Design a protein around this ligand. Structure first.
Ligand SMILES: Nc1ncnc2c1ncn2[C@@H]1O[C@H](COP(=O)(O)CP(=O)(O)OP(=O)(O)O)[C@@H](O)[C@H]1O
Ligand SMILES: [Mg+2]
Ligand SMILES: [Zn+2]
Ligand SMILES: [Zn+2]
Lengths: 43, 133, 181, 147, 263, 114, 30, 65, 56, 392
RNA sequence: AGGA
């Protein structure tokens, strides 16, 4: 329930990759696998 | 139905390369200079150190299931303190009158090299190995 | 945390001091010094992504503030506080993680994907999801009979209510080749 | 599953007498395979266990926080103080024979989660049953009793 | 005195330490197994619910009631319902318990192992009494109620064994060890530098002689002498978990002889 | 749901016998006994005592699948000695040893004050 | 020593106060 | 959610030992490792039962009907 | 591709798999419930008549 | 999926209790099945005609040797592989009691108790000896591994004469799904039915032996010697200097760019190469210090699970992290993270994880490992679709 | 929205 209320969706040049700017803003490991991997980010 | 080889040897080296219960022995015959012996041994059951007198005998007998007790009740064909059973796997011709025979005792390997025991050591699964002292 | 060159006594030192810390914990024991209190006293600040470009951060405070004027072989190999330009300090480096990853014991000892995995499995787990489970009429609901808090915990779990509302049980486990089953 | 990407199914349940045991009379609740560790490099699983083994004896909550000063050598020190062998190994005895195992087992408590995937909620068999209307082919879904 | 010997190291109400000598491991273990698995006990096996206003589920409570240890002293003079000739149950084959509790108090009202009352006839035999080993004499805490929170159940305890369900487990853990000095090499110690240093010494090392390094390997050596600890739950007293284990195993063997006789 | 009844571990089935004795064809004076509603408890016990009988040439036991509470015991004896007799004796030996065990324990237990 | 430098352990007391005030769904609500 | 009767692993009765464990902690000001041990819980299987319990019943009791 | 190249079919079953060291390389453990559902249409022949009469 | 001729095989029904389909472990590889919650499909043929097709063409034993690579697609795996090595060491001897059970367990045993390799003091049989009871009479196999003498001093290679092991330890090379393999020969020589029966036999004996022997793996198996740790720590330290040396050199304009490369391209290749040389060196120090008792080494040895690289990363040092081959880029202006000064090219800044998993990762190390790891999960997700349609 |  907690992780669902802290969820982020990225609609639609390389967004899936874990970017340096994500440090301390979004979880490095919390992403799904497949079509969603790297576009569903968690705070 | 008879014995096949008999001689007394002296231990050069004893080797437990990574093994805890087993050692590969190195020995030469005290009698014939041409005769040497390489053999794997269960040191837990019978320990061996360097420069030991050992009577190494072969023999075909003394082929159906194996019976456990009644050994005192029957003829203990051992006057030896360590007996093994294995197969002959190779007959290496090392020039002249010289020949080498390879014996496997359930993975415990043996290489005996001499010249004279030509009309004895057969290419047989059936061959015992007796050691005393 | 804010770090200032500003210090009568020596070096560039972190604004938040041992006194503020006990002053907060006074309010912790009551259940006057809030989070906003640190924010308005200017001891702590909000840094977005754009502003992060123009700053220099320390990981640890004490461990990364007073310079050198024996070493444990057991610990992981850490760098240094060579920098004198530090503008800010990291409250805690485990705060880089989100809810799911925060329940993982020793994630810094696992191969990164194994964590991306566990961060997706705890959502398929079972336990007490709310204490009013008996009064609510939800389509499908799973409750563990005897939930147990973990024997190995994270300091983050304190804020996540995991100890209060668990998802597992502490099984006595043997890593063994037994019947081959 | 464990908290380390260690998913799995039960393959057999054994009664207490058939299970392997510590001389203390302790028996495992779960038995995981040694092969589940080398390829995976899930070191924290092993540390969790060792830490939790101490935590259960000491009765003090075991901190397994990410960035900390806790060492495998540190936890090991404590376990030996409690009388167990430092690296969490314990001598075990075969349940069927009573004979000592030639090996020592990595035995200790580990947090395991119960997952929403239960066999009886997944098992399905069909041999003639509802057909769609248009295509006149079997319907779809375990729920609808499809093929 | 006879064949296999016994030497009790420490006895109590619920724990027996002893040294079993002049035996085969295969026999100490067969005894180990029986004590866990095959000695009969009495346990609640049917729960009929009349009222429950509790926060717990009818079956959650039901499960707990089974696990509550009951007096199984005279368990031998009770029938297995399977064997008994009645429709369902009776006094020959069961003990009937009752539980009624209601939150009269404003404060949380507790429900205990003691709150159970025998309604059946015990034929003057020591059975069915909930085991209370508790300091304040309460036994197992079954439930908790608030105000109008009521509980009404009728329980039918029956004779059974651990193989059918662990609730009929007469014993908790059973300590078992042999050869504290590894003289038999029945184990190979995992080490880093020294096995002797890294591995703790057993308390049983004191009751056997150290190996003495300057000695050849005793291959002839067989395993006898078993350092054991049997712990009771309460249903049956410690001695009887040992004795009834011996008798159970004995009958189990005797059945095989008798089976051969009919053949 | 696909779960067998727990009593199927110890309670004999409909027209099921404790023992099924068949003669081994591979070896002379050999037999194979199948024990229904029986585990390792009684398996390894009988097997081991048979090993103590000098006239017993071969003895082994096996639980072919853990789902089923039965086991196979193979006995081979010296010509003239019946393997059924070998089992009878090894069984009695067991009972007589347990007999001493019970006696000796009670004797010792009584001596304690706790 | 009311203004003595902070320890690494102290950081948790700060974090503690952040949650006491903000909570885990802060952003949704705000 | 309500103390388990009997340790999962070994089967030692633990159902009685709860109220006392809580007293040894409050009334006797003891630490968990001692309290548990005074109650006889020696094997780690028995220890985790009492030690790692989360008595949720107490929350559920707080709702009127 | 949906209804001709591929099709939903009768006489089909699906469950979780688990390994067994006591099964022969070529056999498959079939849960009783599944066996009691999946049927094979055997013809009444003199060789089976009696056997089939019993399964019925 | 069902990307294989062998992803659909015919089996013999075995009606059993409990709600799961049970399959032999060796059959696991062709299907690509595991038991972390996989499900499978069963199809019942309704004809006498279709049944024949299944038994006569798609039967599991027929599928043993596969045309895809002209070698067996099924072999001994996991527990049985791990235990088959252990059972077959020179050191391994079994006493009568167990030998008799090890025998009765082979469902085809001749009823002949073989003569022990040691007849007094004490009758002892060897692992080799009794495993040979599974190997049928007529199977001849010869193999020479690195420096195998006809006296096989190391218990290297394999010599099986008339279904009897003479020398060599049995593992992945002999019993696995390999070209010269005991399995390839058994099918080719004796039949698919005889070979499939052999699978069962090897596993019934090996599994039984291992049940009673045991096998485990713990943290102890990741721990490396204090001196070996000193040696590894100083190995990384020298590599870090070698890197700094080339770093001062390239900043002083002294570096000479490789033909067909930037001056920078040249430097980075060198930096990346020293760091990797090190990760291996340090990793190679661990695998040497681990005794023959190291359960991890024991699995790497049998080939049942794991390789050098796993020992390396777990015990010694994780290594350099890569995103698109190139080490951690400057996402921030001239730096990888805000805890670094600008224009920092050092291993630590560009993502070299100096620490082992046993030791734990630093927050920088952690996040860099995370960037790298996530790249894999993306490329599996991308490729898994491309690859499926190629097959179509 | 989840599963291998
Ligand atoms: N999207 C997909 N489509 C088809 N098959 C898939 C799939 N995802 C997973 N699989 C199958 O499931 C198998 C297992 O993948 P995972 O469940 O992630 C464990 P693993 O990656 O094999 O590593 P491990 O054995 O060391 O644990 C794959 O090898 C593949 O056949
Ligand atoms: Mg899988
Ligand atoms: Zn009755
Ligand atoms: Zn316990």
């Amino acid at each position: 329930t907690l992780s669902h209320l802290r969820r982020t969706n990225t609609p639609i040049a390389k967004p899936r990759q874990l970017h340096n700017t994500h440090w301390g803003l979004v979880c490095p490991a919390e992403t799904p696998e497949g079509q969603a991997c790297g576009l569903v980010k968690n705070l | 139905s008879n014995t096949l080889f008999d001689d007394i040897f002296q231990v050069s080296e004893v080797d437990p390369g990574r093994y805890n219960k087993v050692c590969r022995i190195e020995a030469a015959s005290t009698t014939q200079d041409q005769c040497k012996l390489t053999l794997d041994i269960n040191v837990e059951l019978f320990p061996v150190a360097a420069q030991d007198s050992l009577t190494v005998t072969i023999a075909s007998s003394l082929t159906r299931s194996w019976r456990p007790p009644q050994a005192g009740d029957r003829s203990l064909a051992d006057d030896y303190d360590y007996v093994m059973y294995g197969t002959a796997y190779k007959f290496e011709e090392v020039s002249k009158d010289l020949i080498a025979v390879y014996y496997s005792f359930g993975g415990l390997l043996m290489r005996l090299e001499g010249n004279y025991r030509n009309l004895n050591n057969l290419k047989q699964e059936n061959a015992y190995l007796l050691i005393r002292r | 945390f804010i770090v200032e060159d500003d210090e009568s006594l020596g070096h560039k030192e972190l604004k938040v001091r041992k006194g503020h810390i006990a002053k907060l914990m006074a309010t912790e024991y009551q259940d006057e010094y809030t989070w906003s209190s640190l924010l308005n006293e200017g001891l702590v600040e909000y840094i977005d992504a754009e502003e992060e470009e123009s700053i220099l951060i320390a990981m640890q405070p004490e461990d990364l503030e007073p310079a050198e004027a024996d070493v444990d072989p057991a610990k992981r190999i850490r760098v240094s506080h060579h920098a004198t330009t530090f503008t800010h300090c990291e409250i805690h480096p485990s705060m880089i993680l989100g809810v799911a990853a925060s329940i993982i014991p020793f994630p810094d000892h696992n191969q990164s994907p194994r964590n991306t995995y566990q961060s997706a499995m705890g959502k398929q787990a079972m336990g007490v999801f709310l204490t009013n489970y008996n009064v609510r009429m939800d389509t499908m609901a799973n409750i563990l009979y005897y939930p147990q808090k973990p024997l190995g915990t994270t300091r983050a779990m304190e804020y996540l209510k995991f100890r209060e509302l668990p998802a597992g049980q502490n099984a006595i486990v043997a890593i063994a080749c037994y019947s081959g089953y | 599953a464990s908290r380390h990407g260690q998913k799995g199914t039960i393959g057999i349940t054994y009664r207490r007498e058939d299970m392997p045991f510590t001389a203390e009379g302790i028996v495992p609740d779960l038995i995981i395979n040694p092969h589940a560790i080398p390829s995976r490099m899930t070191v924290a699983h092993l540390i969790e266990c060792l830490l939790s083994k101490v935590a259960a004896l000491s009765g003090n909550e075991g901190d397994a926080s990410p960035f900390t000063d806790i060492t495998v050598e540190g936890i090991s020190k404590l376990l030996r103080e409690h009388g167990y062998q430092s690296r969490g190994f314990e001598v075990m005895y075969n349940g069927h024979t009573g004979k000592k195992l030639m090996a020592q087992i990595f035995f200790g408590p580990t947090y395991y989660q119960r997952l929403r995937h239960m066999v009886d909620d997944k098992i399905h068999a069909r041999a003639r049953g509802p057909m769609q209307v248009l295509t006149r082919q079997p319907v779809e879904g375990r729920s609808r009793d499809g093929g | 005195e006879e064949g296999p010997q016994v030497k009790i190291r420490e006895a109590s109400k619920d724990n027996v330490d002893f040294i079993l000598s002049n035996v085969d491991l295969a026999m100490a273990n067969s005894l180990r197994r029986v004590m866990i698995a095959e000695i009969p006990t009495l346990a609640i096996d049917s729960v009929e619910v009349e009222t429950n206003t509790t926060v717990l589920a009818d079956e959650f409570i039901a499960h707990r009631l089974g696990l509550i240890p009951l007096q199984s002293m005279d368990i031998e003079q009770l029938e297995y319902s399977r064997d008994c000739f009645c429709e369902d149950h009776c006094d020959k084959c069961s003990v009937v318990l009752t539980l009624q509790a209601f939150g009269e108090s404003e404060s949380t009202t507790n429900v205990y192992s003691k709150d159970l009352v025998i309604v059946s006839n015990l034929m003057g035999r020591n059975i069915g009494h909930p085991i209370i080993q508790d300091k304040e004499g309460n036994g197992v805490l079954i439930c908790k109620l608030r105000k109008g929170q009521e509980l009404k159940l009728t329980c039918v305890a029956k004779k059974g064994i651990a193989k059918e369900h662990a609730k009929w487990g007469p014993a908790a853990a059973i300590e078992f060890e042999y050869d504290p000095w590894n003289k038999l090499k029945h184990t190979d110690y995992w080490y880093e530098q020294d096995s002797a240093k890294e591995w703790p010494q057993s308390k049983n090392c004191e009751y056997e002689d150290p190996p003495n390094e300057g000695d050849p390997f005793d291959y002839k050596a067989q395993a006898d002498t078993f350092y054991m600890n049997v712990e009771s739950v309460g249903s049956i007293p410690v001695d009887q978990v040992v004795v009834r284990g011996i008798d159970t195993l004995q009958k189990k063997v005797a059945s095989i002889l008798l089976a051969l006789t009919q053949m | 749901m696909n779960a067998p009844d727990r009593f199927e571990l110890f309670l004999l089935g409909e027209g099921e016998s404790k023992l099924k004795i068949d003669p081994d064809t591979k070896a002379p004076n050999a037999v194979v006994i199948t024990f229904e509603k029986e585990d390792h408890t009684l398996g390894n016990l009988i097997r081991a005592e048979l090993l103590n009988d000098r006239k017993v040439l071969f003895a082994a036991y096996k639980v072919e699948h853990p789902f089923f509470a039965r086991f196979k015991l193979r006995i081979q004896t010296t010509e003239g000695y019946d393997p059924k007799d070998a089992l009878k004796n090894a069984c009695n030996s067991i009972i007589n040893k347990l007999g001493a065990l019970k006696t000796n324990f009670e004797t010792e237990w009584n001596l304690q004050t706790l | 020593d009311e203004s003595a430098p902070i320890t690494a352990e102290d950081s948790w007391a700060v974090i503690s106060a952040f949650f006491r005030e903000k909570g885990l769904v802060s952003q949704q609500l705000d | 959610m309500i103390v388990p009767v009997r340790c999962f692993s070994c089967g030692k009765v633990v159902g009685d030992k709860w109220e006392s464990y809580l007293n040894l902690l409050q009334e006797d000001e003891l630490d968990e490792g001692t309290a548990l041990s005074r109650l006889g819980l020696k094997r780690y299987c028995c220890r985790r039962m009492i030690l790692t319990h989360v008595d949720l019943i107490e929350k559920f009791l707080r709702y009127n009907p | 591709r949906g209804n001709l190249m591929g099709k939903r079919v009768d006489f089909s079953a699906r469950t979780v798999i688990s390994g067994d060291p006591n099964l022969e390389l070529d056999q498959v453990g079939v849960p009783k419930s599944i066996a009691k559902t999946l049927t094979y249409p055997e013809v009444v022949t003199p060789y089976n008549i009696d056997r089939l009469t019993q399964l019925v | 999926p069902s990307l294989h001729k062998m992803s659909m095989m015919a089996h013999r029904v075995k009606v059993i209790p409990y709600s799961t389909f049970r399959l032999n472990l060796s059959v696991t590889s062709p299907y690509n099945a595991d038991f972390d919650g996989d499900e499978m499909n069963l199809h019942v043929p309704q004809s006498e005609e279709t049944r024949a097709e299944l038994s006569q063409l798609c039967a599991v034993p027929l599928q043993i040797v596969s045309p895809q690579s002209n070698k067996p697609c099924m072999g001994i795996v996991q527990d049985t592989l791990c235990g088959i090595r252990k059972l077959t060491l020179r050191d391994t001897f079994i006493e009568l009691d167990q030998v008799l059970n090890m025998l009765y367990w082979v469902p085809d045993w001749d009823g002949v108790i073989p003569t022990p390799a040691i007849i007094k003091p004490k009758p002892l049989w060897s692992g080799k000896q009794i495993l040979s009871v599974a190997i049928p009479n007529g199977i001849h196999l010869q193999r020479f591994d690195e420096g195998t003498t006809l006296l096989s001093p190391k218990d290297n290679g394999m010599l099986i004469i008339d279904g009897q092991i003479i020398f060599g330890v049995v593992e992945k090379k002999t019993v696995g799904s390999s070209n010269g393999g005991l399995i390839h020969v058994v099918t080719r020589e004796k039949g698919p039915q005889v070979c499939a029966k052999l699978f069962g036999n090897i596993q019934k004996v090996v599994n039984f032996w291992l049940l009673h022997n045991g096998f485990s793996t713990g943290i102890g198996d990741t721990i490396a010697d204090g001196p070996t740790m000193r040696e590894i720590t100083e190995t990384i330290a020298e590599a870090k200097k070698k890197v700094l040396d080339v770093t001062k050199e390239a900043q002083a304009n002294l570096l000479t760019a490789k033909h067909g490369m930037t001056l920078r391209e040249s430097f980075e290749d060198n930096v990346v190469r020293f760091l990797n040389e090190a990760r291996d060196k340090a990793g190679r120090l661990a695998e040497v210090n681990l005794k023959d008792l190291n359960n991890v080494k024991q699995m790497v040895m049998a080939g049942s699970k794991g390789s050098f690289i796993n020992i390396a990363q777990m015990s010694a040092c994780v290594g350099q992290q890569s995103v698109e081959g190139k080490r951690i880029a400057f996402g921030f202006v001239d730096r990888t993270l805000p805890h670094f000064s600008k224009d920092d090219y050092s291993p630590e800044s560009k993502g070299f994880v100096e620490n082992s998993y046993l030791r734990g990762l630093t927050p920088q190390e952690f996040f860099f490992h995370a960037m790298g790891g996530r790249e894999g999960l993306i490329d599996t997700a991308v490729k898994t679709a491309e690859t499926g349609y190629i097959q179509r």
